[PDB]
Structure 1
């Protein structure tokens, strides 16, 4: 089992264009969620190729290399299915993935078989490169993979899709990928509306793209036109949980609770293991409940009272279900905890938040939001200013640049100031030092951090902060 040969092979592997070389980092996603999403997208539809390649990479990430190979087998079969003259060239990503998986299974001759096929094809076609072949289809596959890896990848996805569109501006698939990417980037904004209309025009039969157009129309207060698209696709998506859950989102945002629930129930029947779906159901119940409490001025009577009680229990049931199906699905923890807190059940909220705070292997984005919500809980329900500060600070440390940034910095100032009502600053000095360092006030930051070091001369955090401010 030679490290020499392993690294020699690896040098070739790094030359390939495929999921293993596209810097798709497991740290940036919830693997189980991404796996669930891809499985749903594959349901009851051919266009399955990119999804199978990607799913194989995801299986590898989960430590299921055999399942990975199963996915590549399916990808290969689909390529065969197209029966096109472009088989060899259409096979490069799948082959690259095969090479990497076999490499990770300590099976080097097999891996080399695939690198061989790849190099051979690149040779035949006189590629400027030995193991890659410039290809719009590949740019498209890459775009899809990046998109699936989430917000840290959207710009990259957009670039990939643009690159493909460079070659074929009116390719139906490339336009779907581009339009979806711009939609995700809109998440509010409406830059995606034109691209979405064009994508629908190029894909008249496609429910997936229509549902997103409908959502963007809803966003810009064109609810009737949107709803027309939803009705156009309803009969066709009955076994497609991925499309169903977005159509259900459309209804939820229109306050059509029962319709939303109807589609989500259909979706769950196709994929009952899905945390995402259970969580969507929870959001629906919760939203209706909030609506009734609002209309009833927080004093629902009679049947309204019965309904709110039922809705609270259903929401709780589904948030719990989501958590049971994926302990990493952080949103279900925060939504559940927040429901408890709103009902005055502080001990229950605390239990759930505590669980969430102890989850190490979740994404920084989720951690950022968990700290934010626990901070708010501390501030408005526990009335613990000190603890709120701690957690707003942790949220900022995890993610300096997010939508919550201003709220966090502001709140930190406020609370630190409340501290000075009766006591010199203690936690609070660190908070102000951090915030002014962040906002660019080096002098102030320095002062605060100096006081902090005074109090805790051993604190490596303050030491590092002061090392940096020293510059």
Structure 2
């Protein structure tokens, strides 16, 4: 009945952290980066990471190191689970009792499950670090605390970061009601010296057309002694100061060389510089393309679930005139099932354009514009897909004006546009040709 008891402990072993096998190397790197450049909860996660890679002994060393720095119950729960897997269950029962004693003394309603806001935050931070699939739960953890202690600085920050990252998933949807602006303001108010939270508020203000006010918080963060640099670089890049951003990123890269986020941002800077020259040399343009591919390729190498970086890679190979590699990466993208499923719209859309312009294959452009549209969630890319589809369909009707398929697709377009009368008119016109 030890297993039955261990499953009631609140710790990383029972939090159902969604960690894909391919995300394991990157996760470990991101944890270690946090050890140095950002303290108990972080070593607990590192111990769990070490466990999942078959290094229980080295995991205990991270748990024992975590105990040196009520929040101890998570560390005791990981110990219990650890000794269980190692066959040393006699020691596991000890830490089970240490948890029960604290639960007993605090009038906790459960034998081993400690109900308190400290553990709620512990669960939120772990989830917030192990991938976007957990962000809804992570927000719930911090929101649970703020429901009773609305001015709590820790949960106020965790809630704002979670809400901010969830707004990023929906940044391109048409609804686009960003609910993280005020939570961030409150997070900055209750953590006045936390630059990480200040930069996020600035980026969210930049998202809302308030770039000016956002930059004020950017400078305040740069006044305190990689996380500020990596996110500040994004603010400057999107503002236009691409050279300033590249500088901040290369500095941050010295501290955290394995950061896929930095490599991705770095590539986006070179891409921005490639456009600068284009709108204006050839050795410089080819130089930046070769550098952008290098970093996009480095991000996809370290975190192959980085679907978006994989897409910027395939698109950059097009800029380089390397169609065999663009096709190669697009074929990988087409096999994915992104966490943010809306991303698949952009995959199909940009592959549709690739077919339309590089391959001059309107048949396949139509196929992939439809697949992007088949993800019904309204977005900017879905509108572009409907318009591009409308263009090719109209190009096929100016040749063969009685094409059954083109009359159906056009009537389908009008349906998506909300014009139902013209949709029925073309569907009916097509069904008459079908009568043969």
**Bin of the TM-score, shorter chain as denominator length:** 0.7 to 0.9
In structure 1, what is the Cα distance between the partners aligned to 2:86 and 2:362? 52
Aligned pair partner of 1:10 in 3, 8, 15: 3
Matches within 5 A, 1:182-197: 182-187=163-168, 188=171, 189-197=177-185
Shift of 1:149: 3.8
2:310 aligned with 1:333, yes or no? Answer: yes
Deviations 1:53-79 (A, max 9, x none): 23333333444434433332232122x
Shift of 1:408: 9.5
2:34 aligned with 1:41, yes or no? Answer: yes
2:34 aligned with 1:57, yes or no? Answer: no
Shift of 1:328: 4.1
Matches within 5 A, 1:143-292: 143-187=124-168, 188=171, 189-237=177-225, 241-292=226-277
Equivalent in the alignment of 1:109: 90
Equivalent in the alignment of 1:90: 71
2:25 aligned with 1:32, yes or no? Answer: yes
Shift of 1:285: 0.8
Equivalent in the alignment of 1:443: none
- Match of 1:236, SS state, is coil
Of the structure 1 ranges 107-116 and 162-171, higher mean CA displacement relative to structure 2 is found in 107-116
Q: What is the RMSD computed on CA atoms of the aligned residues?
A: 3.7
Q: How many residues were matched structurally?
A: 401
In structure 2, what is the Cα distance between the partners aligned to 1:342 and 1:312? 8
In structure 2, what is the Cα distance between the partners aligned to 1:230 and 1:174? 23
TM-score scaled by structure 1? Answer: 0.73
Equivalent in the alignment of 2:432: none
Equivalent in the alignment of 2:358: 381
Shift of 1:152: 3.5
Aligned pair partner of 1:314 in 280, 291, 295: 291
Aligned 8 A contact 2:50 2:59 in 1: yes
Structure 1 residues 128 and 374: alpha-carbon distance in aligned structure 2, compared to 1, 3 A threshold = same
Aligned 8 A contact 2:349 2:369 in 1: yes
Equivalent in the alignment of 1:132: 113
In structure 1, what is the Cα distance between the partners aligned to 2:376 and 2:207? 28
Structure 1 residues 261 and 13: alpha-carbon distance in aligned structure 2, compared to 1, 3 A threshold = same
Deviations 1:200-220 (A, max 9, x none): 122122111111122122222
Equivalent in the alignment of 2:65: 74
In structure 2, what is the Cα distance between the partners aligned to 1:401 and 1:110? 52
Shift of 1:11: 1.3
Structure 1 residues 65 and 357: alpha-carbon distance in aligned structure 2, compared to 1, 3 A threshold = farther
- Match of 1:204, SS state, is coil
Deviations 1:318-359 (A, max 9, x none): 122323434443333321210122343212312333455567
Deviations 1:143-190 (A, max 9, x none): 222333444333322221121112322222121111212222332544
- Match of 1:30, SS state, is helix
Aligned 8 A contact 1:18 1:96 in 2: yes
Of the structure 1 ranges 362-371 and 128-137, higher mean CA displacement relative to structure 2 is found in 362-371
Shift of 1:116: 2.4
In structure 2, what is the Cα distance between the partners aligned to 1:395 and 1:116? 55
Equivalent in the alignment of 2:100: 119
Structure 1 residues 55 and 378: alpha-carbon distance in aligned structure 2, compared to 1, 3 A threshold = farther
Q: For structure 1, which runs of at least 5 residues remain unmatched after alignment?
A: 1-7, 79-88, 297-302, 437-471
Aligned 8 A contact 1:37 1:242 in 2: no
TM-score scaled by structure 2? Answer: 0.78
Structure 1 residues 242 and 365: alpha-carbon distance in aligned structure 2, compared to 1, 3 A threshold = farther
Structure 1 residues 196 and 329: alpha-carbon distance in aligned structure 2, compared to 1, 3 A threshold = closer
Aligned 8 A contact 1:28 1:363 in 2: no
Aligned 8 A contact 2:286 2:320 in 1: no
- Match of 1:57, SS state, is helix
Aligned 8 A contact 2:299 2:309 in 1: yes
In structure 2, what is the Cα distance between the partners aligned to 1:107 and 1:407? 59
Matches within 5 A, 1:304-453: 305-356=282-333, 365=341, 368=344, 370=347, 373-385=350-362, 387-388=364-365, 403=379, 406=382, 410=386
In structure 2, what is the Cα distance between the partners aligned to 1:424 and 1:106? 69
In structure 1, what is the Cα distance between the partners aligned to 2:108 and 2:132? 33
Structure 1 residues 370 and 9: alpha-carbon distance in aligned structure 2, compared to 1, 3 A threshold = farther
Q: For structure 2, which runs of at least 5 residues remain unmatched after alignment?
A: 172-176, 417-436
- Match of 2:147, SS state, is helix
